[PDB]
Structures are given as C-alpha cells and as structure tokens.
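Appendix B: complex inputs.
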Amino acid sequence: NGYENPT
Amino acid sequence: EIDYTAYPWFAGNMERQQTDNLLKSHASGTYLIRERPAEAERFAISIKFNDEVKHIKVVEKDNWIHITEAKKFDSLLELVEYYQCHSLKESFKQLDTTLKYPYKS
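Resulting structure:
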C-alpha cells in the first residue's frame, strides 16, 4: 500500500 | 557495511515529491534508490515509467533485502545489481523494465 505491490 | 554514496543511482534521504519532480523529465528506466524520510534506514526504488514515477519499498527481514518475497538478496547493492539486468516484470507485471539508467547520468 502507498508504494507498489508485487506480483 | 557498503558505502552507497559511491553509486550514481543513490539519492540519499529524499522525499517522494522531490523524486517525482526530479525523475519526471527523464526516459523510462531511469531510477534512483533513496532513503525514506519517514522510515529511518529504510529504502525505496523510484523509477520513471509510462510518464509516472513508480515507487517500490525495499523490505529488510530476517537479514534478507528484497522488494518481493519471492527473490531475496544479502545486500541492497546485490538487489540493484540483479534488477539492472533482469526486468521487474517477474514480480511487477505493472512495470516491465530493468533498472536501466541511474538518475545522475
């Protein structure tokens, strides 16, 4: 959250 | 301990907004590793792509450095060095690019 999430 | 001040991709402690002001004028694949002003000694990969600056947490857990749980490194330098050659696609399908160009180019 806020950033980027993997996959 | 590695001294990251050496590398032309290390921006030190820098805020999110300043990073999008700095990277917006560059080609896709331009990146920087910065320290997060709200989490001391935690880092982020900021990379321009599709005219927007994406931001990825560098997690440190159980002595691994990683941005996805599915690929881990001993150090931040080794993390960056792996993703300079292998696209982030393998764990960020939103983001098919390697860490091509450090921002101090």
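Chain A touches chain B through five residues (CB under 8 Å).
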